[PDB]
Amino acid sequence: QDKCKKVYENYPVSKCQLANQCNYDCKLDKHARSGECFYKEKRNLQCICDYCEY
């Protein structure tokens, strides 16, 4: 179970609404190729990073 994408310890759900945020941050702290947001729990939200492409 590698998964090019990795879940962030804890990210802001509100700011997650903006893809430019999750990516910018993910590629800033994690320095990952990219970063997107996922829909966890019933309403809660999560932010996952990306370390691959194509």
Swiss-Prot record:
Highest taxon of the lineage: Eukaryota
Gene Ontology biological-process entries: defense response to bacterium; defense response to fungus; killing of cells of another organism
Localisation per UniProt entry: Secreted
Alphabetical keyword list: Antibiotic, Antimicrobial, Disulfide bond, Fungicide, Pyrrolidone carboxylic acid, Secreted, Taste-modifying protein
Major site of localization recorded for this protein: secreted
Cellular component annotations (GO), alphabetically ordered: extracellular region
Keyword Transport tagged: no
Covalent S-S links between cysteines: 4-52, 16-37, 22-47, 26-49
Residues recorded with modification Pyrrolidone carboxylic acid: 1
Subunit structure: Monomer.
Main function: Taste-modifying protein; sweet-tasting. It is 2000 sweeter than sucrose on a molar basis. Has a pH-specific antimicrobial activity against bacteria (B.subtilis, E.coli and S.aureus) and the fungus C.albicans.
Entry's family note: Belongs to the DEFL family.
Name of the protein: Defensin-like protein
Species of the source: Pentadiplandra brazzeana
